[PDB]
Amino acid sequence: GTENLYFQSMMTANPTSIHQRLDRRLSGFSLEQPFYTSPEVYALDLQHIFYKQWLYAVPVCQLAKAGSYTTLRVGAYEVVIVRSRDGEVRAFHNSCRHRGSLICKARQGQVAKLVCPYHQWTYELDGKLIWANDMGPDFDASKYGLKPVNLRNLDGLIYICLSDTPPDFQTFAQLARPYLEVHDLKDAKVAFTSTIIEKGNWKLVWENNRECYHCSSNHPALCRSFPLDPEVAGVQADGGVSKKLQAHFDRCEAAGTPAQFVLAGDGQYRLARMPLQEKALSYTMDGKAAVSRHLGRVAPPDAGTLLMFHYPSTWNHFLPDHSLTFRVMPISPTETEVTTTWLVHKDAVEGVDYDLKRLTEVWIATNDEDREIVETNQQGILSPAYVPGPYSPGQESGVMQFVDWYAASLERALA
Amino acid sequence: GTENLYFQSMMTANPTSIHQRLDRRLSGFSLEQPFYTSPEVYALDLQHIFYKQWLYAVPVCQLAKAGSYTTLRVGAYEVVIVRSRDGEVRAFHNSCRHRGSLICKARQGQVAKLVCPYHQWTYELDGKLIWANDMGPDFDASKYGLKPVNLRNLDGLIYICLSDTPPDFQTFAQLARPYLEVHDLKDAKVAFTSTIIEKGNWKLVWENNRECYHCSSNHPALCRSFPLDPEVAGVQADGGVSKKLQAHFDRCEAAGTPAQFVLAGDGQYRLARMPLQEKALSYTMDGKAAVSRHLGRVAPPDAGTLLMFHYPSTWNHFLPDHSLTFRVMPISPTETEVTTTWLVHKDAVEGVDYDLKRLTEVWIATNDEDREIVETNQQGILSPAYVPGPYSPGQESGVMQFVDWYAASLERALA
Amino acid sequence: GTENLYFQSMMTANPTSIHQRLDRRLSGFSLEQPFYTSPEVYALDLQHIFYKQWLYAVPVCQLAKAGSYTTLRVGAYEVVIVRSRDGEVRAFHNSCRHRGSLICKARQGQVAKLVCPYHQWTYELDGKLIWANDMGPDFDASKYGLKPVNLRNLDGLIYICLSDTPPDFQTFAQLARPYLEVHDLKDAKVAFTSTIIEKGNWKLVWENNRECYHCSSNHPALCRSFPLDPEVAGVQADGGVSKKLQAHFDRCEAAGTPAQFVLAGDGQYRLARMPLQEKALSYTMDGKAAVSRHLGRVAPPDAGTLLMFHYPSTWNHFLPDHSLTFRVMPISPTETEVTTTWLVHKDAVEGVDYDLKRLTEVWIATNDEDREIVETNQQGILSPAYVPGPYSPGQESGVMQFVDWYAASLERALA
Numbered sequence A, B, C: 001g002t003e004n005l006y007f008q009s010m011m012t013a014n015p016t017s018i019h020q021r022l023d024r025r026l027s028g029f030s031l032e033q034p035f036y037t038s039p040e041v042y043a044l045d046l047q048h049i050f051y052k053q054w055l056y057a058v059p060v061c062q063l064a065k066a067g068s069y070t071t072l073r074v075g076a077y078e079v080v081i082v083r084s085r086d087g088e089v090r091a092f093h094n095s096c097r098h099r100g101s102l103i104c105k106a107r108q109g110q111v112a113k114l115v116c117p118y119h120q121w122t123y124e125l126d127g128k129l130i131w132a133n134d135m136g137p138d139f140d141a142s143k144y145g146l147k148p149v150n151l152r153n154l155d156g157l158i159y160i161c162l163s164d165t166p167p168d169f170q171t172f173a174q175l176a177r178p179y180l181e182v183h184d185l186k187d188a189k190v191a192f193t194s195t196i197i198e199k200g201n202w203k204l205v206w207e208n209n210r211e212c213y214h215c216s217s218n219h220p221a222l223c224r225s226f227p228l229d230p231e232v233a234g235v236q237a238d239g240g241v242s243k244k245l246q247a248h249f250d251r252c253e254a255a256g257t258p259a260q261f262v263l264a265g266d267g268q269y270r271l272a273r274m275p276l277q278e279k280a281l282s283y284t285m286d287g288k289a290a291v292s293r294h295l296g297r298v299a300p301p302d303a304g305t306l307l308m309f310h311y312p313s314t315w316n317h318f319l320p321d322h323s324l325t326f327r328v329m330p331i332s333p334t335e336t337e338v339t340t341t342w343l344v345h346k347d348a349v350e351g352v353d354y355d356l357k358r359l360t361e362v363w364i365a366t367n368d369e370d371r372e373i374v375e376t377n378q379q380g381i382l383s384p385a386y387v388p389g390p391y392s393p394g395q396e397s398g399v400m401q402f403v404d405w406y407a408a409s410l411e412r413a414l415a
């Protein structure tokens, strides 16, 4: 399979020479092999991208209850996110300060205190070490609380940053709020979660995500509701919006629902509320709303889909009736974890207000089709005969946009 | 298992120092550990041996039909071999020139055109890019056809070479033709294929193949039909042929069937038509022909077995009634893929002219026994206590011959 | 799982800089990450610790019969231990001197001679090559006997050393004999063996073993019979023995059973006969003897447990009724094999004198609980946020003792 091909390919690969490769890179072409296949570049992507930027973790509604927690792995980091006694959500390194053990072993739960399973060093929900057995009179517990992790709440969506010197989150947060607040995500519940591993590099997952050049042949279910128009998927709107699209933005905004396409100065994130195809209202097989009790106050009913990406961790679709978040996490040079979360109103009842299959089938199928595509792409790229090829200017503008953001971010980090 | 032992062994291994190891190598001894166990030597074997020499791929009869194709992996290369519209068989890198994707995902099939599953760039069966959607007015498709792979047809057997500067194939092809043509391989069909992975280095598979020192204890089925006489398996005939053997060569050649032992000047290949044991006619449990409708025009009926090896990819047995090809492909430092293909006349009918079990049981068993032997050999070699030992001059002349060819080829490539 | 976390963690890890890390190490703290996670340190641990020190292999009673043998893997070494024709137990490298093959493929068995399965080079049970087929007149078999492995018999327990220059074993052997001889281990049989792989570094297995700081929360079955008192598990007795403990040592020694705590000058090994909790006599759920026919002549019946450790390979519990040996063998940087062997009197009859479940359930459970603990510890340590933490002086004195022995041994080896 791909794991073998990965080993085979790295055996004869030329040196990574990253500065030389970055120097000769042209924006209109796919990346040279080792960006997608080498452990050297993968290590740089972890150190300089995933461990330095803000990352989407989970919806805040998963931490609704007192003492609730959820855990996730980011690269080699094990993080626990908890609702503290004061109602604040905080994140910590899930590593006991005694001898290093994980403290929370389950993916989610509720606790009164964080108690290490090894020797029961006990921490308060704010990270403070409040009991350590028989450590002697010269032990200073104030030096041994859990190590915090930088955390922000983006209007009901929890973001974290593993750096001691996180970049600016506030510009993004301020920009996004008008678009997100109308979805009332703090009042959501998780209706379903799907976690899959795709056997391709995280950048291949993103390049695939940032175009619909592949969609008509590969996504029969999605194409019923999501338009193939390159302006929707891509970033050609940044230079100017078509009349048809602006007319949609205006219908939304006349109705009080922010829609207008906005792209970060540095290209890290984009928000836009795009029309669905034809008469579709939601990502379903019949095109109608999946949930009869809407999540948020979006108007009009055919307001379409709020697209939001924030590199490197997340793309999202916020519809009038429900919302979907996607989290991208690196597993190895040729493996990527994608977590899709369906959010519905907290009072929407499964079997009454929505049907689980009807709610999820379209994107379950789509993700599976994307995974197959990404994996097939990865296998060809592993050939030593692979060379960069040209992106379509009309169909892949969004791919070039992502690859530029990635290369610039890496260049800056290596400076 | 062996994968663990591989990791354990490389941890404490001395540096590879390949030039120093090559310098001190004596031809009468097995190779020092890292030749059989190290990823450093494995990488050199791929780069300098498998990616530079002509390799057996598949019988041409698998590409009998219009638009037929077959795919194979050689190291990290994914290759597709196709019968083009003009009747020519060509090979290409199975990597789309857009973003790199595999084009043909199945092991075999038929197509009208080669259509990439990702964004449907469409290629003619000669590799030319004939359609690429929405690539703009400055896109030159003539720069983006599939990359060709050097290919030859050795009398019904397809060989390929991954180098842009392939070595001479013509000397071998010219020498082999008289021996092969009488088997009419272009009129064969594949009756059966067996693919196994042996957990030993590709060179251990070859060293095992090039002797029958192990045969009497390890191959009860084979020994019924294949002689143990070292002159048969080995290369002592190169210095002079025994009277008994020459008498066999003469029976064949008086009957118009080329038999005489011939060995390449550089040792890369050897052809010889050798007698079977006793009264055996074929590789069966009862010694009689497996197929009643013969593949080719070999005479007399006890002409025996045409042995042909061509390093590094193939050994072969061509009998009067059917033929067997073996393809050796490297998987990792301690793994090798061996593909055995049974060829019979295209009009031979399974259940009438041959029985599948009767046709295949002997070599299925033999390959399994060889695999066990090679794997057991590999495990001992992984010990840091392993040191070269002496080959038997009488029983292992053919092993020394292979190891010399390998070492010389590596020396020349590193020069 | 852990294998992924291992790969993730090594990607961004700082250089190992082992001399710098060793230089700054403080004895009161857990080790810096790469000691527990890096392949570089693992390679040094194999080369300088496991391949240089004496290691426990198996009880001699497994080699009771003529021509009996047993095999084990130590790192990448494959070793065979055999009872020779003269009654001596010897060990050899299980690698044929011809081409390297394993000779003995089974874990245990009996043979007349050691016959290589490949080409049947035949060795006497003392390693001498007595037959090699068709090797020519200039073959000197005296140069090609099996390579010996240094072996000692510690009062019924077989120890080996992979170095050509083994350290002193005699000081340990002489010290241990009075304690061990009363267990009559030469008259034992193996009642049961359990082999498990724990997904943590071998040093984490040892650090866990050398404290009961974790025991009250994690070992309900064990705590019924094994005391939590830090003086029992640890090495605080080295500076002076409590009155209660000395009273126990005196009961044993008045009765002729050596008990007194003794610790090696260099800390490599320790023997002590410790009291069990409450009225317990053995490691059972009811606290009574597991076997009605005792192994050895220990007195009094509540003499408790003879604890013996010898780094890096073994800890042991010798009770009045039966004994348990534990063998620690490295598998990878984050994997360790632990083999627990229950020894009972050779005439003790399963189903009459002991019940298999009753005999083994306590330590089967305990080992499983330890494995979970070690694996959870390993996962947290893999975080790049992991930093050394302080050991409990009162509860983890034995952990510091082991870590000191390890660091000193590595320092000396690198000198």
Ligand SMILES: CN1CCC[C@H]1C(=O)O
Pocket (backbone or CB within 6 Å): A209, A210, A211, A212, A226, A232, A233, A234, A307, A315, A316
């Ligand atoms: C639906 N795909 C194609 C382009 C947009 C992307 C998304 O999920 O945002």
Ligand SMILES: CN1CCC[C@H]1C(=O)O
Pocket (backbone or CB within 6 Å): B209, B210, B211, B212, B226, B232, B233, B234, B307, B315, B316
């Ligand atoms: C049958 N074995 C032993 C020597 C020849 C080899 C072969 O398959 O060509």
Ligand SMILES: CN1CCC[C@H]1C(=O)O
Pocket (backbone or CB within 6 Å): C209, C210, C211, C212, C226, C232, C233, C234, C307, C315, C316
């Ligand atoms: C029972 N554990 C805790 C300390 C002693 C250790 C042992 O098995 O020797």
Ligand code: FES
Pocket (backbone or CB within 6 Å): A096, A097, A098, A099, A100, A101, A116, A117, A118, A119, A120, A121
């Ligand atoms: S590792 Fe957490 S209390 Fe010891």
Ligand code: FES
Pocket (backbone or CB within 6 Å): B096, B097, B098, B099, B100, B101, B116, B117, B118, B119, B120, B121
């Ligand atoms: S990768 Fe083949 S058409 Fe895009």
Ligand code: FES
Pocket (backbone or CB within 6 Å): C096, C097, C098, C099, C100, C101, C116, C117, C118, C119, C120, C121
């Ligand atoms: S490898 Fe043992 S006899 Fe040949």
Ligand SMILES: [Fe+3]
Pocket (backbone or CB within 6 Å): A208, A209, A214, A215, A219, A366, A369, A370
């Ligand atoms: Fe898609």
Ligand SMILES: [Fe+3]
Pocket (backbone or CB within 6 Å): B208, B209, B214, B215, B219, B366, B369, B370
């Ligand atoms: Fe064989």
Ligand SMILES: [Fe+3]
Pocket (backbone or CB within 6 Å): C208, C209, C214, C215, C219, C366, C369, C370
């Ligand atoms: Fe324990």
